[PDB]
Symmetry: D3
C-alpha cells in the first residue's frame, strides 16, 4: 500500500511531530478522534499511537517510519534483546526536539562520591534496562525496584536508596527530598525506518521527506550573520562561526550563514576581537 508513519497520539512529542510534517508540506487532519489518518495529498498514512508502542511497531515492520524518543526506543530494544530476540531498525536521523535526560538522584541530606557508591544498593526507576546497561558498563551491581510513575517516592518511602528518572527543572526531586547527581543518558526524538527491503516509490518518498526534514531543522538552527570586515584579524572571525558554506566579503562587511547559534560568549569574543555591529537575522526556510 502507501507509506505508514507512526507518531505519538498525545504527549510530549505530539505537538512537535505534528508540526514537523506540516512544515515538511504534509496536509493532514489531526482534529479527529480517528487514529489512522490519510494525508490529504501525499500518499501517506499517519497512525496516532502510544509512544510506548512505537519502537515495536517499527521493529515488527507493521509501519515503515516512526517518530519516537531515544530513551523509549532503546529501552524497548534492550528489553527484547533480554528476551532473546533480535529487533532490527534503521535510524534515519536524530531530530531537534524532545530533549530529556535520565539521571541518578539521591537524598539531599546525603553526600555523593560517584556511582561506585551505589554498589549493592536498591535503585527505583521506570527505565530498568537503561540503568542496568549504564551501571554494568561501570562494573557496579545493584537491586532494581520497578515503578511506572511517581518514582521520586521511593527513597522517602523506604523502597530504595536512590532513583533514576527523567529530570528537567528539578522541581519534583527537591519537593521529594532528592537531588540530581549524575546524568546517565540524554535523549532526543529521532526518525526510524523498519527493517527489510523498501519498494521503489515509497522509498523515493522516504528519501524525499528526509531532505525536507533537514531543511526545516537547519532553518531553525541556522542564522544569517552580518559583521564588519575587521580586515586584519578577519581570519580569527571565521573560526568562531562554523559557517560551512563560505563567508562573503565586502569592502565599504561580512555576510554568512551560521548553522549553530551565536551564544553570548561567542559574540562576546568576536567583539573583543574588534568586530562591530554584529547582526543576527532569522531564517524562515532554506534549501542548501
Amino acid at each position: 500500500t502507501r507509506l505508514r508513519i507512526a507518531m505519538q497520539k498525545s504527549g510530549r512529542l505530539s505537538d512537535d511531530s505534528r508540526e514537523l510534517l506540516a512544515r515538511c508540506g504534509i496536509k493532514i487532519n489531526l482534529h479527529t478522534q480517528r487514529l489512522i489518518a490519510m494525508a490529504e495529498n501525499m500518499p501517506i498514512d499517519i497512525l496516532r499511537v502510544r509512544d510506548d508502542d512505537i519502537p515495536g511497531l517499527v521493529m515488527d515492520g507493521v509501519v515503515d517510519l516512526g517518530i519516537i524518543g531515544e530513551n523509549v526506543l532503546e529501552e524497548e530494544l534492550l528489553n527484547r534483546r533480554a528476551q532473546g530476540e533480535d529487533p532490527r531498525y534503521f535510524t534515519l536521523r536524530r531530530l531537534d526536539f524532545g530533549g530529556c535526560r535520565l539521571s541518578l538522584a539521591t537524598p539531599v541530606d546525603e553526600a555523593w562520591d560517584g556511582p561506585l557508591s551505589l554498589n549493592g544498593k536498591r535503585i527505583a526507576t521506570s527505565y530498568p534496562h537503561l540503568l542496568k546497561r549504564y551501571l554494568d558498563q561501570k562494573g557496579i551491581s545493584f537491586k532494581s525496584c520497578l515503578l511506572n510513575g511517581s518514582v521520586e517516592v521511593a527513597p522517602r518511602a523506604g523502597l530504595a536508596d536512590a532513583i533514576c528518572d527523567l529530570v528537567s527543572t528539578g522541581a519534583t526531586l527537591e519537593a521529594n527530598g532528592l537531588r540530581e547527581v549524575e546524568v546517565i543518558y540524554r535523549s532526543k526524538a529521532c526518525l526510524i525506518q523498519r527493517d527489510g527491503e523498501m519498494e521503489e516509490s515509497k522509498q523515493q518518498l522516504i528519501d524525499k521527506l528526509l531532505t525536507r526534514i533537514q531543511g526545516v531543522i537547519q532553518a531553525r538552527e541556522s542564522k544569517y550573520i552580518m559583521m564588519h570586515a575587521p580586515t586584519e584579524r578577519l581570519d580569527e572571525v571565521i573560526a568562531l562561526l562554523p559557517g560551512a558554506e563560505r563567508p562573503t566579503i565586502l569592502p565599504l562587511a561580512m555576510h554568512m550563514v551560521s548553522s549553530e547559534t551565536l551564544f553570548w560568549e561567542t559574540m562576546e569574543k568576536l567583539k573583543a576581537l574588534g568586530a562591530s555591529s554584529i547582526l543576527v537575522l532569522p531564517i524562515e526556510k532554506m534549501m542548501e
Copy 2:
C-alpha cells in the same frame, strides 16, 4: 510505623479517592508536589502513585492498603501467576466509583454471532490477561496483539480482526469503524489489604476506617422515602423498596430509608399500585 495507604496520583480514581478519605474524616494536603503525605491528625501516610503500581505495592506488603480498580488489579494478579508467583491480598471491599467495562469490539460493517466466531483470530488489547481468561473459559483460542493505547487502530490498520478495550460513551469505536459486541468484564474501584499479620493499633484503625467508608457510601446511595398508607396493598409497597431496616407507619403515611435508588420504573409501579405523593429526600450522612 504508621498506616500506609496507596492511591493514584493523577487520573481516573484520584479525585474520588481523595474525596473518600476526606469524607471519612481524613485531614491531609494533596496540593503539594510531594508524593508521600502524612495525614494532619490520624497516623496515616498516603503515597500518591501510578495506578499501575498499586496492586504490586500491595502484593509485596510495601504498603498496607490500596485503592485501585478491579481490572488493573486482576490483570496484574494474572500476570504474576503466569510468571509462577503467588501474589496474595485481602479485598476489604468493592467501592462506589471507578466504573468501567472491558469489551469486545469488531468492525461495524461486519455482523456478529458470538465469541466462538473469534476462534483463530487476532485480538488487540492492553489487557491480555483478562481477555485470555475470558476466552479460555469459553474454549476459544486466539492470537494476541499488544498495544498500550490507541487500541482502536488495530482493525482499520491491519493489526487485528478485532479489539478488547475500555469503552464508555462508545465514541472512539464509532470514530474508528468499530462497534461494541460483548462486555467481558465490569470493574469498580476497590479497597485492598496487604497479606500477612496486622498489628493491633493499625488494624484497629483499618477496622475503624472501613465503617466510615460504609457510612459514606450508604448515605450517597440510600434515601429517605415518604409515601402514604395505601392501607390494604400496604404489603406490596415494601417489596419494591428493600428498606432493610423497617418502614414506619402513621395514620393521618410511611417513612423509610432505602438503600437502593428509586428508579422511575419502580416509582411508576408504586403509583399504579395506588401510592400518592411519593417523596425522596437526600441523606448527607448516616450511622446504622
Copy 3:
C-alpha cells in the same frame, strides 16, 4: 419509526435540555459530533439542531417534539402567518428554564413617558414580529430597523430612536448609553408537539415522558416544610403555603410540601404570626 425530539445543539437551552431528559431517565450520548443521536434504551431520537430551526421542524411535522424558547417559537409563528401560512402545533407545556425578557430601551439621557411616545419613531430589533404585535395591540405605529445582533448600537449610531432586545443584567445597555423602560414579552423554554395524528406507541411514550417532566420540575420547585402547631392561628399559616396536598398536624408540629418557594417575605410573615423553628428541606425526587 421511533420518537423524534428536537433540541438546541449549543447555546442557552442545550445544557438544560440535555439535563431534563437525563433527569427523565434518558440514556444517550451527547459527547459526539454526530447530530442525530439514538437513545441507548428508550426508542428515542434526539436531533441536535439550531434553535432557530426548531419551531419550523415542529411545524412541518419533520420531528414529533421540540424544546425551544417562547420568543423564538412565537416569532417564527408570526413570520409564517405574515407570509400567509397556517403553522400548527400543540404546546404540551411551559418549562422551568430559559427565562428571558424582551424589552424596549431608550437613550439614558432621555426621559420616558410610555409607549405612545414611540409613535412614528424607528426601533431596531431582531424580533420584528414580536415588537410589531405588541405596539399594534397598543395602536402605535413605528418604523422597523432590522439587526441580528449588537442591537444596542442602533441609537448611538443614528440607526434608530430606540431598540427592543433581550435584556438581563442590563450591562450592554448601560455600556451602550441606553436604559430599559418597558418589558414587552417574557419567555421560558417550552415543550411542543407536531400537528397531526400520533400513533399509539409513541404517543404512549410522549404521555409517559410528560409525567416524568412534571415530577422533575416539581421536585426542584417544591420543598418539604416543618413548622410548629401555632394552635390558634393555625389557620392563617396554611394560606401562606399553598400546599395543595394537605398539611399534617402533630401535637408534641406541621409537616407539608410546598410547590412554591418560601421567599423571605413569606417566612417573615409566618414568623410574626407566631410560627417558630421554620424548616425547609430539599426534595430530590417526587411522584404525586
Copy 4:
C-alpha cells in the same frame, strides 16, 4: 441617602460576600466594571473596593456597613491607635467564612522551644501590628522586618530569623525551608457598622438584614437529625447533640435540629451508646 455596604471587589472574600447577600435576598448585578452598584429592589448601595480599605471606610463613616476579615480590620485598628487616633466601630457579628490563621514560622532545621526564644530576633511579616500585640502581651521584644508579600523569603535570604504569615496547607513554608510553630491569631470575615447615630429606616433595614444573615448561616451549619428512642440511655443522647430547641420523641424515634455538625467521633459515640440508624439531612433554609 440609602444604605451603603462595603465589600471586597476581588479576592478571598468576594465570592462569599457576594453570595451571602444574594442568599439574604439581595438582587444586584456584579457583572459590571462599575464599582458602586445599586441593588435592584432594596434601597441598597454596594461599593466594591479593596479589602485593605474597608476598615477605614467604616471607621470614617463613609459607608454604613462592611464585610472584612478580622485580621485586616484589627491590623488597621492598631495602626491608627498607634498614630494616636480613636477609630470606632460596632461589630455586628462574626461570619461563617474567610477563615485563616496567622502563624509564627521558623527554619525547619531548627528546633523550637516557645516564643520566649524569639526575644531579640528579627521577624518579617505583613502584619506588624498583630505580631507586636501578641509578643508584647507575652513580654517578648523583637525587631520587625516589613514585607507585603513573599514573606517566606526572609529567612533563607538573611532578612530575618523567622516570619509571621498567613498559613493554610503549609505548602509555601515547606517549599521555603520553614515550618509552622505557633498560631498567634485566627480570623474570620465579620460584618461591621459605622460609628455614630443611625436613622430609623436604614437601621430598620440593618436590623432586618442581620436576621436573614443568621438564618442563612444556621441553615448551612445546622442539620436535621433522626435516631431511635434508645429508651433508657435516652438522656445521654441529647448531651452530644446541643439541639437548643428540644428533641421530639416518638414510640414505634427522635427527630431534632442540630446547630453544630455531627463529626465522626460524636456519631461514633452515639453508636456505642446504643443508638441505631443515625440520619443527617441537609437544611436549605430556616427561620427560628
Copy 5:
C-alpha cells in the same frame, strides 16, 4: 461626520479584522462592551456588529466601509435581488484571511457522478441563494431545504438527499455519514465601500488606508530570497520566482523579493536546476 467602518463583533473574522487595522496604524480599544468605538487618533468609527448585518449596512450606506466574507455578502446580494431591489457596492479589495469553501456533500455509502445527478433531489443548506446560482448555471433543478445550522443532519434524518455547507477539516461530515464531492464556492474576507459620492477628506483617508492594507498583506505574503548566481541557467531561475521588481545580481549571488511563497516543489526545482544555499527571510513591513 467621520469615517465609519463595520466589522464583526465576535466570530471568525473579528480577530483578523481587529488585527489589520491595528497593523494599519489604527489605535482603538476593543476591550469594552461598547459597540461603536472611536479610534484614538484617526477620525475613525468602528461599529462592532453581526457579520450577517454587514452587507446590508454597506448596501444602505449607513456606514462607509465594511469587512465581511464573500459568501455572506454575495448571499445577501442575491437575496435582495430576488426581492427586486438593486443593492449597490464597490469592492475595494479581496483580503488575505477568512478563507472557507462551500461544498456539496452526499452520504458516504453512495457513489458520485457529478452534479447532474442531483436533478430533482432535495438539498439542505444555509446558503440557498449561492447554491441556486451554481446549479442554475448548471441547468440542474432541485428542492431546497433550509436550515441555519447543523446542516449535516439533513441526510441521516430524512430531510434531504444531500447538503451544501461550509467545510474545512471535513470532520463533521464524516461524523455525520457524509463526504465532500464538489466545491461550489470559495470565499475570503473582503473590504467594501458604500455606494454614492464620497467627500474629499474621508475619501482621502479611504484611499490612504487602502495602501497601508496593501503593504501589510504584501509583507506577510512576500519574502526576501537569496540564492547563488547559477551563471548559465540564471534565466530559468527568475521564472520560478515571480519577483515583479527585478532580481539583483552579484559575483562573489542573487537577492530578490518574492510576492508569492516558496513551496517545497518550487524549491525542489530550483535545486535540481543547480541552485545552492537557498534562503528565505521574513519581511516585517514593506513599502513598494
Copy 6:
C-alpha cells in the same frame, strides 16, 4: 556572597523580567514555589518578591539589583523623604517594558479647564506622593483621599471631586463615569543598583549583564532597512532614519540598521520623496 537581583513574583512585570534575564543568558527555574532561586550557572540569586517591596530592598542594600517600575520606586522614594530619611540608589537604566501612565480624571459630565481648577478639591489616589509632587510644582493645593484599589469609585461615591490613577484602555473610567484629562506621570520598568561600594567580581558581572541588556533591547527596537539609491535626494533619506551607524550605498540600494521604528507616517514620507521598494526585516540579536 554572590549577586542578588530582586524581581516581582507575580504581576505586571514578572513575565517580562523573567524573560529579559533568560534573553540575557540566564538559566534559572521559576516553576517552583520557592522564592529565592539560584541561577543554574552564573553566580546569581533571584529573589521573587512583591513589587511594592523592591525599592526598599534596594534602598537598604539588602539586594544588589532590582527590576521595578518608575512609579512604585519614585513613590516610595518620596515616602521615605517625607519621613526624613535619605534613601539612595543608582539607576542603571530605563527598560523597554512596563509602560503605564498616571492621570488625573474627572466626572464626564463636567468640563475641564486645567489643573488650577482642582485647587481646594479632594482627589483620591493610591499614589499620594506622586500626585502631591506634581500639583505642588504647579502651586495647586488639594485634599488627599487615600485608597489602594478601586480608586474610580471615589467620585460617584461622594469620596472625592476627582481621582488620579493608572489608566490604559480607559475602560474603568468610562464605566465609572469619569474621563481622563491630564497625564501627570509616565512610567516604565527600570533596573536599579544598591547604594555603596561594589566588589570587583559581582560588579564585573553587573557591568557584563548591562551590555547584554542593551543588546536584547536594541535588537527588538532596531530593524534592518533596505531601500533604493534615490541618487539625488539620497540626503533627505538618512534624516528620517536615525541609523547612528552609517548607511551602506550600492549601485545596481541602501542597507542600514534603524534603532527606532519605521512608523507609517515616516515611510509615507520616504515614499513621496521618491523611495521605492522599502523593506524592514526583523533582527533577532545584535552586538554593536
